[PDB]
Design a protein around this ligand. Structure first.
Ligand SMILES: CC[C@H](CO)Nc1ccc2ncc(-c3ccc(C(=O)O)cc3)n2n1
Ligand SMILES: CC[C@H](CO)Nc1ccc2ncc(-c3ccc(C(=O)O)cc3)n2n1
Lengths: 275, 275
């Protein structure tokens, strides 16, 4: 009767700051799922756990989205301490793991993954949803032991709907400079992330990584990276152009998801990879 | 039975881009109110009218707030085209009108208004509410024909709750520069506005106003203003210090509402003004 009682919880799959993922089994069907336990914030004024509004944001996004390259939400329940998302079980690991094993990917291998990531982001962007945390750890594989693995985007923990929005009619005389210069975060941030994913897939090298977290942030802000000959000596001009057109400081000058899909590097006719 | 049928609408009081305000009378009590008609957006995808979410934001803020220097929401209804806010009727005009008649205010007159504005903003900020459109047009007087008029803050059309908020736990390696450098809009914007209000109350001069809207925006961003001797030759150093400590580009370096209330110019013992 209680939805919680319909799932038998099993072992931990992993953990983050705010959530623990456990394997589970639906009692009646025997089908397995991933159960993401999100620890609820206890008082509005607390700085721990996740607020009701932040949980609802993620769950509302997961409920709206349906695409082959995006994780599926199967069910949801809540108890005293947690809201539990019952998600499709995906058993081929993360793209992070796959890349770590291969060291780097060829351009044909990289584009087979990227086409899928681009399709999934195209879908999200069509619904005005910015994921805001695209990275290889948030891209799962259905089965890693095939030559062209299928992927699923996960972790909508900081995903947002982007409104079209700006008193544009009133006097600006009393408005603060941060408002005068306000530019909302939007879909372009995902495009930047896709450029970084592309770079790392081709090289195994992180383009902005510094010796300290502060150095990484400084490098990102300055767009301080290059195509080091250690990794890119034989990389195509088209692959470099794709990355350059995404790694742009000004969000308004980055390729859009539509432009990325029409880029020659992605359009290019290639063979599906053999084992 | 229908709430709408309990109010007899009268003449227009004023109009903006998105709203018309009419005088009205509650049929049973005979008491008069201001009725703000907010035109509803017709499709999510439309760029006209006001979205449900934007209406709810304003109405939820008005419902939470109760303070002598803040407008009171009395009732609400909705019809096919509009959501109608029934507000306390305030008949002494705007601070905008009052200043236009006086040309400029003395420091004693200015501080009598400012103490009230500061009290009202103190309250809003205590509830994590940024008004975001403070200006003399959004400050009404109960009665303009007294020496020390009482005021009410109005127009919560772009007011927002400010959360305390920032994947601070994950890698920043894939994060876009606009996210790395993201600073949310917050309570400091109101403090800037209060500095501009103060300046104009003392001089009748707008500090950043240019010949074109673009010039005004450029002046705001650059904090390009001075204390022109035409208006400020006899203004106190304390009044200038108060304004300087608010008109600061970096929001994090502006006086907070608590600091403003403890400033010597505001703390100073003064006589209530005579007629
Ligand atoms: C921390 C959990 C890690 C993720 O790679 N392990 C697994 C293992 C199998 C599996 N199957 C589905 C999922 C999963 C799917 C989605 C999320 C999410 O949207 O945050 C999290 C986990 N996961 N996660
Ligand atoms: C555009 C309407 C102007 C405002 O000064 N006239 C009046 C005249 C009397 C009066 N009494 C209350 C109000 C009023 C009060 C609040 C609002 C609001 O929160 O937007 C708007 C109007 N108003 N507004």
């Amino acid at each position: 009767s209680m939805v919680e009682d319909h799932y038998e919880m099993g072992e931990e799959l992993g953990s983050g700051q705010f959530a623990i993922v456990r394997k589970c089994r639906q009692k009646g069907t025997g089908k397995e799922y991933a159960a993401k336990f999100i620890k609820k914030r206890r008082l509005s004024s607390s700085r721990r756990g996740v607020s009701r509004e932040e949980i609802e944001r993620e769950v509302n996004i997961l409920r709206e989205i349906r695409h082959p390259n995006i994780i599926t939400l199967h069910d949801i329940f809540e108890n005293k301490t947690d809201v539990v998302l019952i998600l499709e079980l995906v058993s081929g690991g993360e793209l992070f793991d796959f890349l770590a094993e291969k060291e780097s990917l060829t351009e044909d291998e990289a584009t087979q993954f990227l086409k899928q990531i681009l399709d999934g982001v195209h879908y999200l962007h069509s619904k005005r949803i910015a994921h805001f945390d695209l990275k290889p750890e948030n891209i799962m594989l259905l089965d890693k032991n095939v030559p062209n693995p299928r992927i699923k985007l996960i972790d909508f923990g900081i995903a947002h709907k982007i409104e079209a929005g700006n008193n544009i009619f009133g006097t600006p005389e009393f408005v603060a400079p941060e408002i005068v210069n306000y530019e909302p975060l939007g879909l372009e941030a995902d495009m930047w992330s896709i450029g970084v994913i592309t770079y790392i897939l081709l090289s195994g090298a992180s383009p902005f990584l510094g010796e300290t977290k502060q150095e990484t942030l400084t490098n990102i802000s300055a767009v301080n990276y290059d195509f080091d000959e250690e990794y890119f000596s034989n990389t195509s001009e088209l692959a470099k152009d794709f990355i350059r057109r995404l790694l742009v400081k000004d969000p308004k000058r980055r390729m859009t998801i539509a432009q990325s899909l029409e880029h020659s590097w992605i359009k290019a006719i290639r063979r599906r990879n053999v084992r």
